[PDB]
């Protein structure tokens, strides 16, 4: 179980990212990337793409929600992050989840 | 749907989306009827005229990478030589994926 998640859940999440060409990269961070996760741990993803806007963000969130995954998926936009502590962790401990 | 979780349905649809030769994906068998249970197999017939053995093998391998609990049987419509099977696919088949 990569990041503790089954392979089909990873491919489904990756599949929604493929639907949007604006996503250059998808970065996994938090407990799943650290290895300090549990079964109830959330899935923290950070998408990189300057063309990404609020209309896209809500569209990915809606499609991921329709997946009905047991774990919560918090999706973020890198160019939107205002927290320097959050950014430092993403750039230091981030894992390459998906490439365009 | 069909006693399947949503993320598994999309994951299977994901593989089908990756191949332009696939026109439709028809789900038959225990699923699409009431007989299926937990652990029943996934019977899928693909429609296309560009599809052949090399694609077929590749799609099955890509779904093997999914590591699904249920066994997935993939068939090509233009290769079904059992008329009773083909009649049932037209009779009770439910459209799983469309271009």
| Pairwise CA distance, residues A78 & A86, whole Å | 10
Q: Which residues contact B9 (CB under 8 A, 6 or more apart)?
A: B1, B2, B96
Residue at token pair 């052949």: B52
Q: Domain of B93: which CATH number?
A: 3.30.460.10
Three-class SS state of A72: coil
Which tokens go with B29?
């068998």
Q: What total of structural domains would you count in chain B? A: 1
| Token representation of residue A66 | 């329709």
Whether B1 maps to a domain, the answer reads no
Note the maximum CA span of chain A: 34
Interface test with B, best of A10, A15, A66 (most B CBs within 10 A): A15
| Residue range of the domain that includes B19 | 6-98
Resolution in A: 2.8
CA dist., res. B42 & res. B87, Å (int): 18
Name the structure determination technique.
Answer: X-ray
Contact in structure between B42 and B27 (CB atoms under 8 Å): yes
Biggest alpha carbon distance in chain B? 34
- Render chain B in DSSP notation, one character per residue: -TT--HHHHHHHHHHHHT-TT--EEEEESSTTSTT--TT--EEEEEE-SS--HHHHHHHHHHHHTTT-SS-EEEEEGGG---HHHHHHHHHH-EEEEE-
- Tell me which chain A residues have a C-beta less than 8 angstroms from the C-beta of B67: 6-8
Of B5, B6, B11, the CB nearest to A11: B11
Chain B nearest-CA distance from A50, in A, is 25
CA distance B34 to A58: 36
Do A29 and A93 touch, CB atoms closer than 8 A? yes
* Chain B residues whose beta carbon lies within 8 Å of the beta carbon of residue A68: 5-7
In a domain, residue B53? The reply is yes
């Amino acid at each position: 179980h990569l990041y503790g998640l089954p392979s089909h859940a990873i491919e489904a999440l990756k599949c929604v990212f493929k639907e949007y060409s604006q996503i250059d990269n998808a970065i996994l961070y938090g407990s799943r990337a650290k290895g300090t996760y549990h079964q109830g741990s959330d899935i923290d993803m950070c998408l990189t793409g300057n063309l990404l806007g609020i209309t896209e963000l809500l569209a990915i969130e809606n499609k991921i929600d329709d997946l009905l995954l047991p774990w919560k998926v918090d999706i973020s936009l890198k160019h939107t992050i205002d927290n320097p502590d959050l950014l430092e962790h993403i750039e230091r401990a981030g894992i390459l989840f998906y490439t365009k």
